[PDB]
Structure formats: structure tokens, C-alpha cells
Structure 1
Amino acid sequence: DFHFSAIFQPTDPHHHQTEFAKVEGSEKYVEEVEVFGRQALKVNPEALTILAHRAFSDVHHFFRKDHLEGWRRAIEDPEASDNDRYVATTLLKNACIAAGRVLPSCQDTGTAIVLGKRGELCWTGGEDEKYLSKGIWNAYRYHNLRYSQTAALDMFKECNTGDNLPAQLDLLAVPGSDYEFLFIAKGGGSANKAYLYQETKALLNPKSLRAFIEEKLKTLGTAACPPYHIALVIGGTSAEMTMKTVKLASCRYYDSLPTTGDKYGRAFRDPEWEKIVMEVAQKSGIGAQFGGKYFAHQARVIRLPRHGASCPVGLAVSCSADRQILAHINKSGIYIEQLEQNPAQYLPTSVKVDLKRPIDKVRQQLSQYPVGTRVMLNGTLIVARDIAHAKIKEMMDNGEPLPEYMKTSPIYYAGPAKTPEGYASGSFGPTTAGRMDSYVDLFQSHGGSYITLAKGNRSKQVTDACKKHGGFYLGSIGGPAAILAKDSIKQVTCLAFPELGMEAVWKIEVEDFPAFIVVDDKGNDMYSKTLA
């Protein structure tokens, strides 16, 4: 009467559909043995250091075919908007710079996430987390990446860990004698777009579910650098199980799941509703960041079993920095997923803005154009993001003035990766503007931050502030951190708060920096029609 049925039953559990390359001479780190009648694998734990180092190096310079195919699709589709094509060409060009293995594809080299599946008869000595972390530590310390992890000394006092540790190390116990891995370099921006909804049976009908999807996709906006790999999970045995599934779905880790359910509650991919998600994404008009058709590369929809009283729902994306890498260790050595090393094969109206003027002259010029105008910035930018804004607001709350460097130049929300030797700058693309939304009106009423430069749609309070104070929000393309570093950024200098690491205040000299006018000084928002 009892029948065991696993929730997840992929037809390709070992990811044979993926191409792997064996690390040279890595068979010296493994040995096949037979203990108590069973085949087992002795693994030198140094193999985990080697594997994690190479994984978190390669993943910042190369992409999977399905990601690159999406960018070419946006360029070649006659139905794509001009802005769709412009963004996809920029991102593909950026991937070509990153393939040089010097500049990472994004300044946000992400949180290191390891999903490991150690077989019952795979023996490493048991110090897997330490040895994996050292390999991650090696990748971020000795390559031109970024230290993005923020340690809490108490509830509110924070510091950068200086090495991109700690990693998220999810090590699972599974049958057999191999060691299987999924490594993810997960950007903070795309991580912030992982959403959990507590729903009910009233959602579970075609009309309600479609309306739900139309409503929730808009809340993703453009803040996580679309085109998106959109993942949606309906159901789950718990919120954390739902959120883990939607993360893995976004990495296309569950692509070989069955496509039908059964009376035992197994998970399944729903291709009909993936098609509906894609239809909503295209008809939304949100586009590849600035209006059009290519809001999404592709969609994954996974239906999960549920408690009768529960319906958790997960929504997540993978961003332009689509960075995951499969790997395994077996009796033959260390195998790591082979990424596309020649992205160039996938490649088939502007207003010059002189910033080397008083900020009021720059504001006047910007006032002459409507939202949606593409501009090219030439001059000095002051760079500040989350913590700097918080420190500055605190200074003003204690009677101190708004710093002079918040009034001379447009404010670029960004945090750079490390500078390669002999380079003007490391990868240096924008960060999400919405996170600074609560400082705009305050700073503008005190005579600064009249012009901001970042990526993503912003809230109505920012539109109101720019109209009230004669301000502007310029949207940079999100994602192309390397080509911006290589072509646009000529000089980088730390201005204030050097203890903050990448979150210090910087002053940079730029040339031909592309941006769109998203919010003008008149109440207009380039996203007001597609993200209403």
C-alpha cells in the first residue's frame, strides 16, 4: 500500500545534457576502492579547492549557449524594438570583453553559492566547507573580482569581509560515490528579485493565475538587468523549499523534470504555462530594459505539491550576469561544465552631454529633451551607493551639511570591481536605483543629487522629487560592466569612506557613457506606461 515517490524526478539527474571538461591530471586526487562489498571514492579534499577556484573564475568570463542565444534572438527578431537591439548588442559586446579573462562580465561578481551532493560512499575527510571556501577565496583574492559580503558586527554596525566570504554552502547527502555540484555566482540585484507569495486555492484557476502573473512580472521591473530567465514555482512543502526550487529553476537545473503530475505529488515542469509567462513578458512592453519585446529570455514554471491549507508561490529571475556552472568529481577526476568561449559568433540618435560644466548648465540642457532620449555623458561622475547615502543622511541629521561632492556632478550609483594591473578601472556598471529612492527628495531639498545615474525603474516619490526640485534620473544600461570599464571609464579615484571598500565614494572621469533619460524634471517617467 506504501509507495515512495520522490518530489523531484528529473530524467537527467546527472546532467548528461551538459558538456564537461576534465581538469588536467585531476585523477591524482581521486581513488576508487571497494569497502565492505561496495564501490567507494577516496577524494583528496584539495580537489574541492581546485574545483571551486576554477568554477568561480570561469563563470565570470563566459556564458551558456541559451543565454547567448537569447541576446542574438533579441537582435535579429524583426519584432524587437530598437532599444531591445541596442541593449542586447551592448551585452553581447560586453561578453566579448569578458571572454578576455581579465574583466569580469559584471562588477557585481556576486555571492558564492555551492550546491553540493556528496554520495554516501564519497569520502573527502569531511572538511568540505573549509576546502571549498579556500578555493572561492582564491578566485576572489587573485582575480579582478569584487568583495561584496557585508559582515554584521552588531545589529547595525557593519564592515566588508574583504574576501567575498562567507559562501553559501549547501552540502546534501545522496546515494552513490560521486560528488556533484552546482556553483552559482549570484548577483545581489537578481537575488533581490526573488519573491515569496503566500496564496490560496482561489489562485488555482486559469483566469486568476494569469492575472497573478501579469501583476507580479511588472513588480520585477528592470532592476535586475533583463532579459530575464524567469522562474515561477506554484506550491511547495514550505516557503524555503519553494524559494530553493525557484532559485534552481532559474538556473535551468530542473529542466529535465517530467511535464505531468501524478497522485503521489511529484514536481513537474508546465510548458503550457511557461508559454503563457513568455506571452505576458512580451506583451508587457517592458522590453530589454528600455521598452520593447525582450523582457525575458525564457521561462521555467514548476508545479509542486502542497498542504491543503497552503499555496506558497516563488518568483525569481536570473539576470544578465547569468552565472552558474555544473561540476562533478568521480573516479576519473574533476569535471566542470564547458561554457561558451567565443561569444562573438552570436553577434550578427544620441545627445552628447558635457558634464565639465556647472551642474545647473547640465540640468538646463537635460531639460530640453523628453524621457526616452539617449544621452552620452562626458566628464566627472561622483560614485556613491547604499552605505554612503546612509552615512551622508546621518551627517545631515546631526546638523552637518550635504557634502560638496554631492552637488558638483551627477551621482553614479555603483561599486567597482578590482582594477586589473595597467587598466584604468575594473568592471564598473551601475547598481539598482530604487534602493536609494528614500534619499533623493531629502538630498535635493538640500541642494544635491539633482542628477542621478543608475539602472532600473524608480518609485513615484523620485518622480515627484525631480519635478519639485528640477532633477533628473538617467538610466544606464545594466549589465555591461566590462565594456564600460574598457571604453568609457578613464580615471578612478577614491573620494571618501575608503573603509567601505567597493561602497566608498568614488570620483571617476568618463567618456561616451551611454544612458537614457528615465525621469525628467517635469513629472515624466519612461516606465510609467509599461510598469503601471
Structure 2
Amino acid sequence: DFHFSAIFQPTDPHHHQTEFAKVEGSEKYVEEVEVFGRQALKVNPEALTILAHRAFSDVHHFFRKDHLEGWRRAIEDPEASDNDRYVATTLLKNACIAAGRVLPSCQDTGTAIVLGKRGELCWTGGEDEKYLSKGIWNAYRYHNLRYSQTAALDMFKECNTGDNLPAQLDLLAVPGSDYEFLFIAKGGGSANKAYLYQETKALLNPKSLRAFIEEKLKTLGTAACPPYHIALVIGGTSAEMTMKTVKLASCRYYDSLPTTGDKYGRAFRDPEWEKIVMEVAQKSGIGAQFGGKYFAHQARVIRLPRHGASCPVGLAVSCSADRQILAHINKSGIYIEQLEQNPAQYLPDITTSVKVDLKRPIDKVRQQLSQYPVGTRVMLNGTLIVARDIAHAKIKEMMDNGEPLPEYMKTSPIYYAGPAKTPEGYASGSFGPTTAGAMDSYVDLFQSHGGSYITLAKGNRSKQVTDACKKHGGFYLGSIGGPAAILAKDSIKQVTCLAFPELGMEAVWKIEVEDFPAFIVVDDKGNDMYSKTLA
């Protein structure tokens, strides 16, 4: 009566539906042998370095077709809002810049994640983690990417690792003699929008599940640069298994799963509820960051088995920096997924913004902004003072010790961002905004001390920021989230380090910008352009 049933039964387990390119000459890294009557493959571990290096280079300059098609859909759909089309056009133009292979598509070049599946008879010498890490190290060291990993010297003392290591290296033991991979360059903002819910059987009916989906999708907000690939996993054998599944679902790794369950508890994709997720996302009005229909590119819904007493649920997104790449090593060499190298083909063949001069007293800038309602698009020209999470924490710590808010926090709008490395001969590397919500706890304090009256970042913010701006006559401006390469190429004209150089990308910078687009998200009157869609 025993019947083994693997939980995951893809019809395309080796991803034949994906197009791959062979690394030229790479068959020299492999050798077919036979031991004890079984076919095995000897792999020079240098192949893992070569592969990881190319993967974490390619993925920062090109996108998959299904991602690019989503931006085109947002441009061509009559039901898309004007802001939907504007945002998607900006992201497509950014992708065209990134395809130049100099600037990465986002300043957050992400955490390096490797899902590896090493066959029983695939023999590497066993030092896979080191050789993969050397390839990741190469990609981030010798290209214009960013070192984003923060080491803990103790519970609270931190430093940047300076090389974007350590990677997340999940190497699985599987049948056969090949080595198969999914590489992910996972941005922090979308990683933060991976949520775990501990639910019950009471959720598992159509009315409760739809209400749940409507409630939770809003908590994603715009803080991870939509349009999103939305992934929803219902059930699972443990919290960690649910969350791993929702990550992989968001990378479209489970697209070939069956679409029906069985009495053995196999996983399945649920197209009916994917359509419902898309309807909820579209009808939400949240839109592609600034109101409209294109909150989501597409949706993936996986139903999993569960312990009778349990119902873990996972919700996660892939952001505008949608970065994954499949690969495999076999008897013919190294193969790597082919991404779209001509994103410009997705762009169409075919008095809308307020010019804001920042080279004025900051009180003059506040006065001009006060004339306009939330949702007004502005174009910024002048100096921004750049500071995000660690710089804000350090400045608050100084003030807690009796020191004043530094003067450089009062002269210019505060841009929450951390730049990638500067290409030779460029004024700036990729330099888009970080998530605004992480700085929310500092706004009222800083404004009470005469600074941070105007902030510039991306994402909806908490009510304390709306209240602070109303109390102190402040504003929060929402940059487009994601278009870091076109901002650097076209808008950022000069970058200088002003304070805290030891923080790396998290130092305080003074930058000069031109034609920098943003929306007035929070005004000085209690208004918030997300108050209706994210209520």
C-alpha cells in the first residue's frame, strides 16, 4: 500500500522551456567516466567559478521576456493609468541603459543566492561553496555593482563586508550526474516583502481566502518597486519550506507543476486563484507605484499539503529588479539561461510636471511645494543630501548624546539611497532610491530639530510621517523606484562624499541632480497619495 509521491512534480524538471547558451569551450571542464557500472561526471570546480561569475554579471544588465512583456502591457493597456504607463516606460528605458553592460539595472545589486542541485554522481571535488563564492566575488569586485552585505561583529556592531559576501548557498543532493542551478540576485526591498502567516483551517474557504488576499496584498504597498510578480503559497510542511517555496514561485521556478492535487498531497499551481490574485491586485488601484491597474505583472499560487493543526501561508514578490538565471553543467559543458539582450523592442513605436529649483533656501522650496496637492509630479534640480538606514541611526545616536542635528541635514532635501560603484569616466554609478519606510522613525525627531523637512525615496510610509509633515510643514517626495541606471546616466551630475566615509555605500553623500522626477506623496497638510489605495 506504500506509494511514494514527491511533493514537487514539475513536468519540466530540467527547464527545457528555457533558452540556454553554451559557454564556449566549456566542455574542457567536464569528463565522462564510469565507476561500478554507473555513469559519472568529473567537473573541474573552476567551472563553478566561471558559471557564477557570468550569472551574476548577466543578470544585472538583462531581463526575462515575461518581465519585459509586463512593462509593455502596462504601456499598451487602455486600462492602465497615465502613471502606470509613465512608470513602466521609465523602467523599460532604464533596462535599455542597463543592457549597455556598464550600469546595473538597480543600485541594489542584491544578495547573491545559489540554488544548486548536484547529482549523486557529479563529482566536483566537494569545495563547491568556495568556488561558487569566488565567482560571485569576481562578479561584484570587477564590475560596477555594489557591496550590500552587513557583517555583525557583535549583536549590534556592524560593518560592510566590502565584497557582497557571504552568499546564500543552498546545494541539494539529487539523482544523476549533472549540476543544475538557479542563481538569484535578490534585492533587499523585495526580500523584505516576504511574509509568513500562521493561519488555520478557518481560512480555507472561498470567502475567507479572498478577503485574506485583499488584506495582505495592500501590506506589500509600493515599498518593493511594483509592478510585482506576486507569489502566494497556501500550506506547507514547515514555515521554512513555505517561505522557500514562495521565493521559488516568485522566480517562476515552479511554473511547470501540476494544476490539480491528489490524495498523496502533491503540490500544485492553482490558475483559478492566480487569476483571483491578479483581479485583487488590479482592482486595488495601487498601480505601478503611483495609482492605477498595474500593481502586478502576474501571479503564482502554489497549494501545499499541511499538518492538520497547521496552515502556514507565504506571500512574496519579485520587484522591478527581477533577477534570476537558470544554468546547468553536463557532459557537454556549461549552459546559462539566455536573457533578452534587446529590451528596446518592447518600447512603443509611438506641462505635466512642476520644475522645482533646489538651489534656493530650503524654506523657499517648502513654500513652492506647499502650493501643490499630493500626486503632483515634480522635476528636481539642485543638491540632494544622501543618507539612509545606518547614517540615520548614527545621527540619532549623536543627538541622543546631546549633539545637534548636523547642519548638512538642514540645507537640502534628504535622498534615501546607496549608490553602486562608479564606472570609470562616469559621474555616478547606479543610484536609485531605497525604501522610505525604514527611515520613518527619524522624521519627526529630525524635523523637530530643523532638518529633514523634505525627503526623497520610494514606497508608502507610515502615519507618523504624514503627521510629522503636517506638524512641521514637511514633504515626502516619491521617486520612481527601480530606474537606477537611467537616473545615474541622465539625472545625477556630481557625487561627493560628505560624511561617514567608513559606511561605504551608506555614507552621507552630497549629489547634484537635474531633471530628477518625483511625485509629491505626503504634503504639509495631512494628505497622502496612498491614503485611499493603501487604507
Q: What TM-score results when the alignment is normalised by the length of structure 1? A: 1.00
Q: Deviations over 1:112-154 (max 9, x none)?
A: 0000000000000000000000000000000000000000000
Provide the C-alpha distance between the structure 1 equivalents of 2:32 and 2:293, rounded to a whole number of angstroms: 52
Q: Secondary structure at the match of 1:243?
A: helix
Q: Deviations over 1:73-103 (max 9, x none)?
A: 0000000000000000000000000000000
Provide the C-alpha distance between the structure 2 equivalents of 1:105 and 1:293, rounded to a whole number of angstroms: 24
Provide the C-alpha distance between the structure 1 equivalents of 2:43 and 2:405, rounded to a whole number of angstroms: 57
The runs of at least 4 consecutive aligned structure 1 residues that moved more than 6 Å come to none
CA shift for structure 1 position 382: 0.2
Q: Deviations over 1:351-393 (max 9, x none)?
A: 0000000000000000000000000000000000000000000
CA shift for structure 1 position 108: 0.1
Q: Which residue of 2 aligns with 1:205?
A: 205
Provide the C-alpha distance between the structure 2 equivalents of 1:385 and 1:96, rounded to a whole number of angstroms: 28
Provide the C-alpha distance between the structure 2 equivalents of 1:467 and 1:397, rounded to a whole number of angstroms: 24
CA shift for structure 1 position 512: 0.3
Q: Which residue of 2 aligns with 1:527?
A: 530
1:126 and 2:126 matched: yes
CA shift for structure 1 position 476: 0.1
CA shift for structure 1 position 479: 0.3
Query: How many residues end up aligned between the 2 structures?
Result: 532
Provide the C-alpha distance between the structure 1 equivalents of 2:229 and 2:393, rounded to a whole number of angstroms: 32
Q: Deviations over 1:480-514 (max 9, x none)?
A: 00000000000000111111000000000000000
CA shift for structure 1 position 18: 0.2
Provide the C-alpha distance between the structure 1 equivalents of 2:18 and 2:131, rounded to a whole number of angstroms: 25
Provide the C-alpha distance between the structure 1 equivalents of 2:30 and 2:217, rounded to a whole number of angstroms: 46
Provide the C-alpha distance between the structure 1 equivalents of 2:176 and 2:498, rounded to a whole number of angstroms: 55
Q: Which residue of 1 aligns with 2:413?
A: 410
CA shift for structure 1 position 278: 0.1
Q: Secondary structure at the match of 2:306?
A: strand
Q: Which residue of 1 aligns with 2:273?
A: 273
Q: Secondary structure at the match of 2:422?
A: coil
Provide the C-alpha distance between the structure 1 equivalents of 2:33 and 2:254, rounded to a whole number of angstroms: 32
CA shift for structure 1 position 204: 0.1
Provide the C-alpha distance between the structure 2 equivalents of 1:405 and 1:332, rounded to a whole number of angstroms: 58
Provide the C-alpha distance between the structure 2 equivalents of 1:118 and 1:189, rounded to a whole number of angstroms: 30
Q: Secondary structure at the match of 2:80?
A: coil
Q: Deviations over 1:170-224 (max 9, x none)?
A: 0000000000000000000000000000000000000000000000000000000
CA shift for structure 1 position 307: 0.2
CA shift for structure 1 position 110: 0.1
Provide the C-alpha distance between the structure 1 equivalents of 2:498 and 2:247, rounded to a whole number of angstroms: 37
Q: Deviations over 1:243-264 (max 9, x none)?
A: 0000000000000000000000
Q: Deviations over 1:437-486 (max 9, x none)?
A: 00000000010000000000000000000000000000000000000000
CA shift for structure 1 position 71: 0.1
Q: Deviations over 1:397-423 (max 9, x none)?
A: 000000001000000000000000000
Provide the C-alpha distance between the structure 2 equivalents of 1:32 and 1:254, rounded to a whole number of angstroms: 30
Q: Which residue of 1 aligns with 2:490?
A: 487
| Structure 2 unmatched ranges of 5 or more | none
Q: Which residue of 2 aligns with 1:395?
A: 398
Provide the C-alpha distance between the structure 2 equivalents of 1:72 and 1:222, rounded to a whole number of angstroms: 19
Q: Secondary structure at the match of 2:103?
A: coil
- RMSD over aligned Cα atoms: 0.2
Provide the C-alpha distance between the structure 2 equivalents of 1:507 and 1:208, rounded to a whole number of angstroms: 50
CA shift for structure 1 position 64: 0.2
Q: From 371, 375, 386, give the equivalent of 2:374.
A: 371
Q: Secondary structure at the match of 1:527?
A: coil
Provide the C-alpha distance between the structure 2 equivalents of 1:358 and 1:350, rounded to a whole number of angstroms: 21
CA shift for structure 1 position 231: 0.1
Provide the C-alpha distance between the structure 1 equivalents of 2:311 and 2:499, rounded to a whole number of angstroms: 48
Provide the C-alpha distance between the structure 2 equivalents of 1:414 and 1:92, rounded to a whole number of angstroms: 21
Q: Secondary structure at the match of 2:301?
A: strand
Q: What TM-score results when the alignment is normalised by the length of structure 2? A: 0.99
Q: Secondary structure at the match of 1:248?
A: helix
Q: Secondary structure at the match of 1:262?
A: coil
Q: From 448, 452, 458, give the equivalent of 1:449.
A: 452
Provide the C-alpha distance between the structure 1 equivalents of 2:257 and 2:497, rounded to a whole number of angstroms: 49
Q: Secondary structure at the match of 2:372?
A: coil
Provide the C-alpha distance between the structure 1 equivalents of 2:532 and 2:302, rounded to a whole number of angstroms: 30
CA shift for structure 1 position 436: 0.2
Q: Secondary structure at the match of 2:493?
A: strand
| Structure 1 unmatched ranges of 5 or more | none
Provide the C-alpha distance between the structure 2 equivalents of 1:390 and 1:291, rounded to a whole number of angstroms: 32
Provide the C-alpha distance between the structure 1 equivalents of 2:82 and 2:34, rounded to a whole number of angstroms: 62
Provide the C-alpha distance between the structure 2 equivalents of 1:297 and 1:494, rounded to a whole number of angstroms: 37
Provide the C-alpha distance between the structure 2 equivalents of 1:210 and 1:142, rounded to a whole number of angstroms: 47
1:306 and 2:306 matched: yes
Q: Secondary structure at the match of 1:377?
A: strand
Provide the C-alpha distance between the structure 1 equivalents of 2:93 and 2:76, rounded to a whole number of angstroms: 15
1:498 and 2:504 matched: no
Q: Secondary structure at the match of 2:117?
A: strand
% identical aligned pairs: 100
Provide the C-alpha distance between the structure 1 equivalents of 2:233 and 2:501, rounded to a whole number of angstroms: 42
Q: Secondary structure at the match of 1:74?
A: helix
Provide the C-alpha distance between the structure 2 equivalents of 1:427 and 1:266, rounded to a whole number of angstroms: 43
Q: From 350, 354, 358, give the equivalent of 1:351.
A: 354
CA shift for structure 1 position 317: 0.1
Q: Which residue of 1 aligns with 2:52?
A: 52
Q: Secondary structure at the match of 1:39?
A: strand
CA shift for structure 1 position 38: 0.6
Provide the C-alpha distance between the structure 2 equivalents of 1:75 and 1:153, rounded to a whole number of angstroms: 47
Q: Which residue of 1 aligns with 2:81?
A: 81
Provide the C-alpha distance between the structure 1 equivalents of 2:141 and 2:500, rounded to a whole number of angstroms: 22
Q: Which residue of 1 aligns with 2:297?
A: 297
Provide the C-alpha distance between the structure 2 equivalents of 1:17 and 1:5, rounded to a whole number of angstroms: 24
Q: Secondary structure at the match of 2:485?
A: helix
CA shift for structure 1 position 313: 0.1
Provide the C-alpha distance between the structure 1 equivalents of 2:356 and 2:92, rounded to a whole number of angstroms: 25
CA shift for structure 1 position 429: 0.2
Q: Secondary structure at the match of 2:214?
A: helix
Provide the C-alpha distance between the structure 1 equivalents of 2:404 and 2:464, rounded to a whole number of angstroms: 23
Q: Secondary structure at the match of 2:109?
A: coil
Provide the C-alpha distance between the structure 2 equivalents of 1:100 and 1:406, rounded to a whole number of angstroms: 35
Provide the C-alpha distance between the structure 2 equivalents of 1:189 and 1:479, rounded to a whole number of angstroms: 10
CA shift for structure 1 position 42: 0.3
Provide the C-alpha distance between the structure 1 equivalents of 2:176 and 2:407, rounded to a whole number of angstroms: 63
Provide the C-alpha distance between the structure 2 equivalents of 1:493 and 1:225, rounded to a whole number of angstroms: 27
